[PDB]
Paper text:
TRiC is the most complex chaperone system identified to date. Here, we present an ensemble of cryo-EM structures of endogenous human TRiC throughout its ATPase cycle, with three of them revealing endogenously engaged tubulin in different folding stages.
We therefore used nucleotide analog ATP-AlFx to trap the complex more in the closed state to facilitate a high-resolution structural study. In the resulting dataset, the majority (65.4%) of the particles were resolved to a closed-state TRiC map at 2.9 Å resolution, while the remaining (34.6%) particles were resolved to an open-state map at 4.2 Å resolution. For the closed state, through focused classification in the chamber region, we obtained two maps at 3.1–3.2 Å resolution: one map showed tubulin density in the cis-ring chamber (termed TRiC-tubulin-S3), and the other map showed no substrate in the chamber, but a central tail density in an orientation different from that in the open NPP, S1, and S2 states (denoted as TRiC-closed, discussed below). For the closed S3 and TRiC-closed structures, the nucleotide densities for all subunits matched ADP-AlFx and a magnesium ion very well, in addition to a water molecule attacking the γ-phosphate of nucleotide, involved in the formation of the ATP hydrolysis reaction center.
Residue numbers in the entry:
A (entry chain a): 254 to 354
B (entry chain O): 234 to 388
C (entry chain e): 78 to 538
D (entry chain M): 50 to 441
E (entry chain L): 7 to 529
F (entry chain N): 249 to 347
């Protein structure tokens, strides 16, 4: 950066791009989110506020058995012919009850 | 009848301040930086020149560029001189050691009569002689052993 | 090259090193003379004489040997045509080494190698201008005096011409590359027009560094640093042979032998800074891949190169040490043009001078001066022992003939050459060579006689 | 005891701990590591028999071990060794003339003559009970890649051998296509019919150059122009691949940068394209000769002419040690073939690999010299009787 | 110096064990390689204690002495003497080792005779001067009448290969050695004859290739054979250039400009290959490595690409095709291309090699050595190297002398004729010089098993009255004429055997004190 | 420090003093977002700088510094609060009234 006035706009952009994906995969009706990567403490706020279950650091072999049995699509990134954030919301999985016993 | 230029500057092409980052944008200005680095060193050699200073003495090393420049202009130089020898050289010729080459004049250069490089004991020695206003001297010892000359120095 | 851990014998190592650094001819004789003064002082020590009184008696006895050595001394060297006293002086130094097969050939090499590089106005000889190189192969008779320089030729192109008839040598110190600065740059490229400007910058730089040599009329280039692959083919298209990766002081010898100037950059090249040379070629030696440079023709060069060949590395490294002693005795003749006659002739004549002044007066130091004269006779009697003769039989005959008449140059030899006259056998040594043999051996004896305690430790750890 | 059909194998356990069972004489002497200087020359003798003939390599030690054993009485009878070397050359030059008269000129068009030659070399190995399958597969793996009646040379480097643990030796296959041991990412399809295979040496990832490249971000909206332009870059690479008409991609294994990123993997899965990574740089010669593809380096030259063809390119999900690829059928097949070797243990496959190479080298000798003799100690008796009459 | 020793761990000896250890250590070197001299001498097998011992059988005396590692100080002079003999003439390294050891063995006989060692040096300098005139006056020159010079070259290669492993292959390996140097037609660079060793086959299956062989086969999707092609080689970088500007980065503001730079990088790499195919070529040889982006460009244009042959591989291709290196492609009218007929690939020992069949101006050869073991191929390579180096100097110095013991008896006769015109002090040392020259036909005669006491006596009686060409016949075991049998050696080879052994024996005989220092890490 | 490779090139004199003022204004931005709901006790799991203590001092706010993660989930059930990780995304339902 060559100007100190453009400092805080870059620092807030590291979380605004992060919260942009978390709002378009959650407003389509998704309640259970499984992730093989990592969900940090800032992203856990958007599921408690919306009332959604977020599971992190699951196995790659366990995600394929859930997505094949529930009709979900194993998505890695954004896609579908130069779209900003589409997520293909018709390809969500289904479940009768997701209960932690 | 030479004149001695006692210096404390580097006569090398690689004289860098160790914090300079020359960011260039085009190839027309890239060649201008490399031509400027030779023009910085050659401007220092023109300050030693045109003043009568045929003998150059500096405690800092001199590269291959300034060595060949003085050989073409029929000038002698001597780099990496110890600081104990330049302090004795300053009181012998009656000059002054100039770190910056921009303030060179007739009042800061030395003056002697006989300046030769002999072959005493196999090794070469650049000796100065003939200056009447000599506030110092040098006693060269010659012996047959290293412990013989150390006792002669102690005596 | 010994591993002697003895502090008395370590001073004999520095005594032979001090003779090599100053004169360089009597490094063997200065150790036998110092051991002879201490052997004669052993019997003087048992008689009750103080060791400093023997040391003070040797200074009054060595002073007579210096003044008597300056009696007969003359040379007619003019470095034009009277090289006959210069060849016979170098034959005395080379006669004791293993170069006696080339006793006439290699003696004339060391005479002409000094006179072409010496400054006769200052009487100063610089040994940095005399390059002594060696390569195995051939024989000892193939040692030639190459007027010029001999370097390892490193033509980057294998199709380069290996023979230049008339070389306009362009000596430069800049590598054949785009100019890289000495500081950190990190040049920024933004658009594709700047990257296409990078290609045209280097393409015109290799055409500029090649054209600036051809505009000066040069047909040979010397470079200290490496070459680029793009610059190698541009040498063959323009018919410009060039060598690569020459050493530091090697190109310093090219600019003196060819009369050229070492140019830092390519822009400062001109026709006045070019060197002149004749037959520039590389010579392959047998099955090896060295291809050293041979410079046949020159124009008033002040730098020569001796190429020593032999049958093995034992005969070459000794010939580098043997001929260096021959290059030093010609240097001592320019420093002082006075000579003496060796073969033990000067030691017997100096032993008679101390014995004549031992009676004028025999007050206190009579026994100390006679021990000096008996120790000066050890060097000629060692020549009689190595030649298969008898020491006390041959020395009594030569010493008696110098008293019955006026003392001539009377010594000994191995095959004896008929008569024992050193003036007829042409055994000529320098005055300052034997002047420093008596002076350094006396002062080293004084530092090993004036010591009465040893404080050496015990074991190493 | 390791010569002939009634010979037994040897097992050499090295200092590392990799014990292998071997019956071929070249593989035994290379693992024994004999310290005697005269016995190491017999190791290199069996090594050059494996290079020149391939099927002479226990027998060259029995001959050279007996020719020196016959020199024990010769050196104790005042015969100089130069006289023995002169007479052994005269027995050698007369020995080839005896074997040439026993030879029968054959032709490579007769499959029954080549079948009995390959079955003879398998009788001494562990696959002598599998000579009804391996010996027909050894002839068909040679006579389809030599292009006979036109050349007297055959390279065995065009016949790849894949070693997989599982099953028995009867489960071996002679698939003429390409067999790869790499996995399929992503493995959601693993089968495509009428496939067009393309070899890509370009790295489908973020743009980077050989020179040092950096991105300057000094604006709020400049971070949006970094991620969204990188997605539009690889989308132009996938759509250039998809509009060509290919369904199977073979990406060469890159070391400097990443060959296939996670962003590039998601676009190739939505285009229904099977992607295979980690193709070695030394294996691209065998791929382009088998399928018929061309190595595509830049994406601007990726056209339909540089693609291949395959009737079936599927990943055969095996029950044993994982799975492999198997391309079945291709237009204009080259002079290459692949042999899949099975086995119950890891030691039987290493012996079955050396026994197949001893079987392919027998048919290799028939291409260079179209002549054969009787076996089973037959020419050694005729060399013993004719040279005895020659010595008289 | 032994009495009151002032050394730490170093020892020395003066005139008692100095010449004793010098004569023991030098004779044992000469008696080691004594059994390898002559056309009927055996060979040695050299082995180490372990840790990749790498056994290497050699009959040449230089390769034996350079690997044994003698601990004797005076024996290293004879080891270094045979190293120079291999580097200068390439032959006579065994003959110079036995001759230098027989001089010191005769000098050990002068120990009990109380002869001064400087008298033996002065006696051998006059003996060596008389021996130089015997070889110089008996040298046979060859100028014109080239059908006798090519027959003379086969006698040189037939004499050198007779003392090696190639005993019963003189009908083939003589033609492989004469025609290899005859195809050079110039200087003896001794690197255009690239020797390729391949296992499998006998030594009679070896041959001299009419063209040139190479490795690093032609690309992936490139043609394997092109008839009547124009060969252009190169020594330039193809891909990942990083062209000569250290400290230059690509500093952009967006990732779309990085895609424009890397497309501009591949366009300049494409434009470089487009400058190569403007010459109208069909084959390309690069000394550096060729990556995948220029390899597709040569394959689309039907041009071969041989990547990373060798550093000296482009030098042999420049001498066998008649082109130039041509590392810069900007002037097609100043670049000379090569010429060939077939660039087909041949298979030698289950390895595909690129055969450059039918080349023009072929001043380079390729010897395809095939042997039973690797030990035979390592011996036949050094045996051919000892034969090609003499023929590369026989074309430079056409003077030849009659070998097989005939040259040694001519040298021993000139010393004995001048030993009778000398006083008795130096005449005894000259007779010991002539006896050591007669030992060299005695070692050759006794290695075959002949009566060496009578054959050298018949050679001395023959050379005493005429018979300047009489020598030792090792075929039948008698005395025959060397001009009829055709056993000749080069003059410069036989001179370096005489001269280097006389200089090396001069050094060891002049040693009266061996002062060895304390070694490091030896306890 | 952010999770990036942020590096500032300071050429003018006013640029270095502006960065040290933007670090103070960033703390005042998040401290103004948490006082719009008028709290009394602010409890976090990470550090609180002295500039953040200055705005909470004049607003009469008691701040606890380094409460554990397991203790924050326990006080969220006792007081009825919601653990937020963003000061500018605070709502009225995230305030633990009834304590
Ligand atoms: N032809 C000769 N006749 C008599 N004596 C000679 C002859 N040549 C050399 N010498 C003697 O041999 C000695 C060799 O001394 P040297 O070992 O060379 O001294 P340094 O070790 O100082 O070089 C000389 O002192 C000289 O007197
Ligand atoms: N069916 C058979 N009947 C008799 N002998 C056989 C039969 N099959 C193979 N042999 C013999 O077994 C031997 C196997 O030799 P082998 O070890 O393969 O030689 P190499 O090690 O050179 O390949 C052959 O010499 C052959 O005579
Ligand atoms: N056909 C022959 N007849 C007689 N003597 C021969 C014949 N061939 C070789 N020789 C002798 O064998 C010797 C072999 O010497 P060699 O070991 O090759 O010396 P170097 O090791 O120096 O090359 C030669 O000196 C030569 O005289
Ligand atoms: Mg001397
Ligand atoms: Mg078999
Ligand atoms: Mg020979």
């Amino acid at each position: 950066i060559t100007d100190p006035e453009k400092l805080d706009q870059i620092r807030q952009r590291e979380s605004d791009i992060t919260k942009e994906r978390i709002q378009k995969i959650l407003a389509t009706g998704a309640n259970v989110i499984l992730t093989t990567g990592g969900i940090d403490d800032m992203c856990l706020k958007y599921f408690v506020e919306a009332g959604a279950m977020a599971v992190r650091r699951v196995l790659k072999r366990d995600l394929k058995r859930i997505a094949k049995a529930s009709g979900a699509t194993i998505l890695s990134t954004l896609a579908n012919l130069e779209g900003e954030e589409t997520f293909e919301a018709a390809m969500l999985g289904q479940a009768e009850e997701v209960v932690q016993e | 009848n030479p004149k001695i230029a006692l210096l404390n500057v580097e006569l090398e092409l690689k004289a860098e301040k160790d914090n300079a980052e020359i960011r260039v944008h085009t190839v027309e200005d890239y060649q201008a930086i490399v031509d400027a680095e030779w023009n910085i060193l050659y401007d220092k050699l023109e300050k030693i020149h045109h003043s009568g200073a045929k003998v150059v003495s500096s405690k800092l090393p001199i590269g291959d560029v300034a060595t060949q420049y003085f050989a073409d202009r029929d000038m002698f130089c001597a780099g990496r001189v110890p600081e104990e020898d330049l302090k004795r050289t300053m009181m012998a010729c009656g000059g002054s050691i100039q770190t910056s080459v921009n303030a060179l004049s007739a009042d800061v250069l030395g003056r002697c009569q006989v300046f030769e490089e002999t072959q005493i004991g196999g090794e070469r020695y650049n000796f100065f002689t003939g200056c009447p206003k000599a506030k110092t001297c040098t006693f060269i010892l010659r012996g047959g052993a290293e412990q013989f000359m150390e006792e002669t120095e102690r005596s | 090259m010994m591993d002697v851990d003895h502090q008395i014998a370590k001073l004999m190592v520095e005594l032979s090193k001090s003779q090599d650094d100053e004169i360089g001819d009597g490094t063997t004789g200065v150790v036998v003379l110092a051991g002879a003064l201490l052997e004669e002082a052993e019997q003087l020590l048992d008689r009750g004489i103080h060791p400093i009184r023997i040391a003070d008696g040797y200074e009054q006895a060595a002073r007579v040997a210096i003044e008597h050595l300056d009696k007969i001394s003359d040379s007619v060297l003019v470095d034009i045509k009277d090289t006959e006293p210069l060849i016979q002086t170098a034959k005395t130094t080379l006669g004791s080494k293993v170069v006696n097969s080339c006793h006439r050939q290699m003696a004339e090499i060391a005479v002409n190698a000094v006179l072409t590089v010496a400054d006769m106005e200052r009487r100063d000889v610089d040994f940095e201008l005399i390059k002594v190189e060696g390569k195995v192969g051939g024989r000892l008779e193939d040692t030639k005096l190459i007027k010029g320089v001999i370097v390892d030729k490193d033509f980057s192109h294998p199709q380069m011409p290996k023979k230049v008839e008339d070389a306009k040598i362009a000596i430069l110190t800049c590598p054949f590359e785009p100019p890289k600065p000495k500081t950190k740059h990190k040049l920024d490229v933004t658009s594709v027009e700047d990257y296409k400007a990078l290609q045209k910058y280097e393409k015109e730089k290799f055409e500029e560094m090649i054209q600036q040599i051809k505009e000066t009329g040069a047909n040979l280039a010397i470079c200290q640093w490496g070459f680029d692959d793009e610059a190698n083919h541009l040498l063959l298209q323009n018919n410009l042979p060039a060598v690569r990766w020459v050493g530091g002081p090697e190109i310093e010898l090219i600019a003196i032998a060819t009369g050229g100037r070492i140019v830092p950059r390519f822009s400062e090249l001109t026709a006045e800074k070019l060197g002149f040379a004749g037959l520039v070629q590389e010579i392959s030696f047998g099955t090896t891949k060295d291809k050293m440079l041979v410079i046949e023709q020159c124009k008033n060069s002040r730098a020569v190169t001796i190429f020593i060949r032999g049958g093995n590395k034992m005969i070459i490294e000794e010939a580098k040490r043997s001929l260096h002693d021959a290059l030093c005795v010609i240097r001592n003749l320019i420093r002082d043009n006075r000579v003496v006659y060796g073969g033990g002739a000067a030691e017997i004549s100096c032993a008679l001078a101390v014995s004549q002044e031992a009676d004028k007066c025999p007050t206190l130091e009579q026994y100390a001066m006679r021990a000096f004269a008996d120790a000066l006779e050890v060097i000629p009697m060692a020549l009689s022992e190595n030649s298969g003769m008898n020491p006390i039989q041959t020395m009594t005959e030569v010493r008696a003939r110098q008293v019955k008449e006026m003392n001539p140059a009377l010594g000994i030899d191995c095959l004896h050459k008929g008569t024992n006259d050193m003036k007829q056998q042409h055994v000529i040594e320098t005055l300052i060579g034997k002047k420093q043999q008596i002076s350094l051996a006396t002062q080293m004896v004084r530092m090993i006689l004036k010591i009465d305690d040893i404080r050496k430790p015990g074991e190493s750890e | 005891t390791s010569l002939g059909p009634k010979g037994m194998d040897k097992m050499i356990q090295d200092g590392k701990g990799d014990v292998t069972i071997t019956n071929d004489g070249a593989t035994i002497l290379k693992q024994m590591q004999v310290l005697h200087p005269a016995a190491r020359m017999l190791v290199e003798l069996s090594k050059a028999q494996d290079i020149e003939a391939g099927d002479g390599t226990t027998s060259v030690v029995i001959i050279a071990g007996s020719l020196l054993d016959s020199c024990t009485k010769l050196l104790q009878k005042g015969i100089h060794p130069t006289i023995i070397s002169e007479s052994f050359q005269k027995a050698l030059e007369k020995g080839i003339e005896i074997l040439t008269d026993m030879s029968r000129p054959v032709e490579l068009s007769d499959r029954e003559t080549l079948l009995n030659s390959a079955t003879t070399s398998l009788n001494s190995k562990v696959v002598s009970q599998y000579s009804s399958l391996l010996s027909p597969m050894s002839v068909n793996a040679v006579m389809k890649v030599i292009d006979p009646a036109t050349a007297t040379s055959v390279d065995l480097r065009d016949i790849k051998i894949v070693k997989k643990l599982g099953g028995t030796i009867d489960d071996c296959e002679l698939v003429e296509g390409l067999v790869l041991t790499q996995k399929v990412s992503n493995s959601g399809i693993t089968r495509v019919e009428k496939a067009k295979i393309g070899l890509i040496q370009f790295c489908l990832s973020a743009p980077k150059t050989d020179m040092d490249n950096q991105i300057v971000v000094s604006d709020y909206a400049q971070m949006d122009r970094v991620l969204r332009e990188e997605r539009a870059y690889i989308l132009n690479l996938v759509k250039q691949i998809k509009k060509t008409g290919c369904n199977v991609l073979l990406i060469q294994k890159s070391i400097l940068r990443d060959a296939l990123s996670d962003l590039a993997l998601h676009f190739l899965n939505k285009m229904k394209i099977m992607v295979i990574k980690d193709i070695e740089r030394e294996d691209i010669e065998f791929i382009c000769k088998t399928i018929g593809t061309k190595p595509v380096a830049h994406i601007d030259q990726f056209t339909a002419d540089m693609l291949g063809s395959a009737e079936l390119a599927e990943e055969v999900n095996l029950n044993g040690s994982g799975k492999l690829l198997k391309i079945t059928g291709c237009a204009s097949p080259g002079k290459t073939v692949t042999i899949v070797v099975r086995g119950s243990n890891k030691l039987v496959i290493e012996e079955a690999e050396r026994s197949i190479h001893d079987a392919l080298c027998v048919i290799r000798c028939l291409v260079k010299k179209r002549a054969l003799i009787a076996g089973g100690g037959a020419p050694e008796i005729e060399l013993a009787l004719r040279l005895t009459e020659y010595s008289r | 110096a032994p009495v009151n020793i002032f050394k730490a761990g170093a020892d020395e000896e003066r005139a008692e064990t100095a010449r004793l250890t010098s004569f023991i250590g030098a004779i044992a070197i000469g008696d080691l390689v004594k059994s390898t001299l002559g056309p009927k001498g055996m060979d040695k097998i050299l082995l180490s204690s372990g840790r990749d011992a790498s056994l290497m059988v050699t009959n040449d005396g230089a390769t034996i002495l350079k690997n044994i590692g003698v601990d004797n100080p005076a024996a290293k002079v004879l080891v270094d003497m045979s190293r120079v003999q291999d580097d200068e003439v390439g032959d006579g390294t065994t003959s110079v080792t036995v001759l230098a050891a027989e001089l010191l063995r005769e000098a050990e006989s002068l120990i009990a005779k109380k002869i001064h060692p400087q008298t033996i040096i002065a006696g051998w300098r006059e003996a060596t001067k008389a021996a130089r005139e015997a070889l110089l006056s008996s040298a046979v020159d060859h100028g014109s009448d080239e059908v006798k010079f090519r027959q003379d070259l086969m006698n040189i290669a037939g004499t050198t290969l007779s003392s090696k492993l190639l005993t019963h292959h003189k009908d083939h390996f003589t033609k492989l050695a004469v025609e290899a140097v005859l195809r050079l037609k110039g200087s003896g660079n001794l690197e255009a004859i690239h020797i390729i060793k391949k296992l499998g086959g006998s030594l009679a299956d070896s041959y001299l290739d009419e063209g040139f062989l190479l490795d690093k086969k032609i690309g992936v999707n490139q043609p394997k054979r092109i008839e009547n092609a124009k060969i252009l080689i190169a020594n330039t970088g193809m891909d990942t250039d990083k062209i000569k500007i250290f400290g230059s980065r690509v500093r952009v503001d967006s990732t779309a400009k990085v895609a424009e730079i890397e497309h501009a990088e591949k366009e300049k790499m494409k434009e470089k290959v487009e400058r190569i195919l403007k010459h109208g070529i069909n084959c390309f040889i690069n000394r550096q490595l060729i990556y995948n982006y220029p390899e597709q460009l040569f394959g689309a244009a039907g041009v071969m690409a041989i990547e990373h042959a060798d550093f000296a591989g482009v030098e042999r291709l420049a001498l066998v095709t008649g082109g130039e290196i041509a590392s810069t492609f900007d002037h097609p009218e100043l670049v000379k291309l090569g010429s060939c007929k077939l660039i087909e690939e041949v298979m030698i020992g289950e390895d595909k090699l690129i055969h450059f069949s039918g080349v023009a101006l072929g001043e380079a050869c390729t010897i395809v050595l095939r042997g039973a073991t690797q030990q035979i191929l390592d011996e036949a390579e050094r045996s051919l190297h000892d034969a090609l180096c003499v023929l590369a100097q026989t074309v430079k110095d056409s003077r030849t002398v009659y070998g097989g013991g005939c040259s040694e008896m001519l040298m021993a006769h000139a010393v004995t004729q001048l030993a009778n015109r000398t006083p008795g002090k130096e005449a005894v040392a000259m007779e010991s010089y002539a006896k050591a020259l007669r030992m060299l036909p005695t070692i050759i005669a006794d290695n075959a098993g002949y009566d060496s006491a009578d054959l050298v006596a018949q050679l001395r009686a023959a050379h005493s009255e005429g018979n300047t060409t009489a020598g030792l016949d090792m075929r039948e075991g008698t005395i025959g004429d060397m001009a009829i049998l055709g056993i000749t050696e080069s003059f410069q080879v036989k001179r370096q055997v005489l001269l280097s052994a006389a200089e090396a024996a001069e050094v060891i005989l002049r040693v009266d004190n061996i002062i060895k220092a304390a070694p490091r890490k030896r306890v | 420090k952010g999770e990036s490779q942020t590096d500032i090139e300071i050429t003018r004199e006013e640029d270095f003093t502006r960065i040290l003022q933007m670090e103070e204004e960033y703390i005042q931005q998040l401290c103004e977002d948490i006082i719009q709901l008028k709290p009394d006790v602010v409890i976090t799991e990470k550090g609180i700088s002295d500039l953040a203590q200055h705005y909470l001092m004049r607003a009469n706010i008691t701040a606890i510094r380094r409460v554990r993660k397991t203790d924050n989930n326990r006080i969220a059930r006792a007081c009825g609060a919601r653990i937020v990780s963003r000061p500018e995304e605070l709502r009225e339902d995230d305030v633990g009234t009834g304590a």
